[PDB]
């Protein structure tokens, strides 16, 4: 178990997020840091676009960078949609085997298996989704999930603040 590491990683990243000059920088910092520190092979952050009923990719490490600001996933659909509707984490060892998973080989991404999807919720309002993936067919351990969930609370506040300032 690596809970002590998680704690110090949280310390460093909480520091870096609060020092970030804007929301975009905070999000981009997080996906990179998570992959480096957990470690994990991909990390993506989606923000809700309530008018169009879609999640929009807003930061990624591991995925095609051009998809940032462009990749849209419909509310309620797929595994990521399921995370959003449950408003609970989904932690799996082999995501592609889940009945809700939508396989998109055309996108030319790596073959991930391990999956941790975490709802980003501000006082009961879903604002986005944090998605962590790895090549190994392993779920994420307890301290990893706790770390990511605790982090998502911070991300929710940062997104809410950006929205409240008209920065989105």
Q: Which residues, 133 to 152, sit near a copy of itself by CB under 8 A? A: 142-143, 146-147, 149-150
Nearer to a copy of itself, 66 or 165 (CB): 165
Which ranges in 22-141 belong to alpha helices (H)?
Answer: 23-37, 78-86
Structure token pair of residue 83: 């995370």
Does 85 help bind Na ion (rule: CB under 5 A)? yes
What is the C-alpha to C-alpha distance for residues 140 and 1, in angstroms, rounded to an integer? 11
DSSP 103: -
What is the C-alpha to C-alpha distance for residues 95 and 72, in angstroms, rounded to an integer? 19
Is the peptide bond between 39 and the residue preceding it cis, with omega within 30 degrees of 0? yes
Q: How far is the CB of 101 from a copy of itself (least distance, A)?
A: 27
What is the C-alpha to C-alpha distance for residues 4 and 116, in angstroms, rounded to an integer? 20
Residues 67-86, mask of contacts with a copy of itself (x by CB under 8 A): --------------------
Does 34 help bind a copy of itself (rule: CB under 8 A)? no
Q: Which residues contact 144 (CB under 8 A, 6 or more apart)?
A: 2, 6, 38, 116
Does 122 help bind a copy of itself (rule: CB under 8 A)? yes
Residue of the chain from 78, 84, 114, 128 that contacts Na ion (CB under 5 A) = 84
Does 164 help bind a copy of itself (rule: CB under 8 A)? no
Interacting residues with a copy of itself (CB under 8 A): 1, 3-4, 6-8, 10-11, 14-15, 18-19, 122-123, 142-143, 146-147, 149-150, 153-154, 156-157, 161
């Amino acid at each position: 178990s690596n809970a002590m590491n998680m704690l110090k990683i949280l310390r460093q990243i909480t520091q870096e997020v609060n020092a970030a000059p804007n929301l975009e920088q905070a999000l981009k910092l997080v996906v990179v840091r998570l992959c480096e520190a957990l470690p994990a092979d991909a990390c993506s952050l989606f923000i809700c676009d309530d008018v169009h009923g879609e999640y929009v990719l807003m930061a990624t490490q591991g995925l095609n960078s051009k998809q940032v600001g462009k990749l849209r996933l419909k509310f309620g659909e797929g595994l990521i949609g399921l995370v959003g509707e449950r408003e609970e984490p989904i932690n799996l060892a082999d995501a592609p085997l889940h009945p809700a998973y939508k396989h998109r080989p055309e996108l030319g991404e790596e073959d991930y298996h391990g999956f941790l999807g975490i709802p980003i919720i501000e006082q009961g309002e879903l604002l986005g989704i944090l998605v962590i993936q790895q090549l190994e067919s392993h779920h994420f351990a307890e301290e990893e999930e706790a770390f990511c969930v605790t982090l998502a609370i911070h991300l929710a506040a940062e997104i809410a603040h950006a929205r409240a300032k008209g920065a989105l």
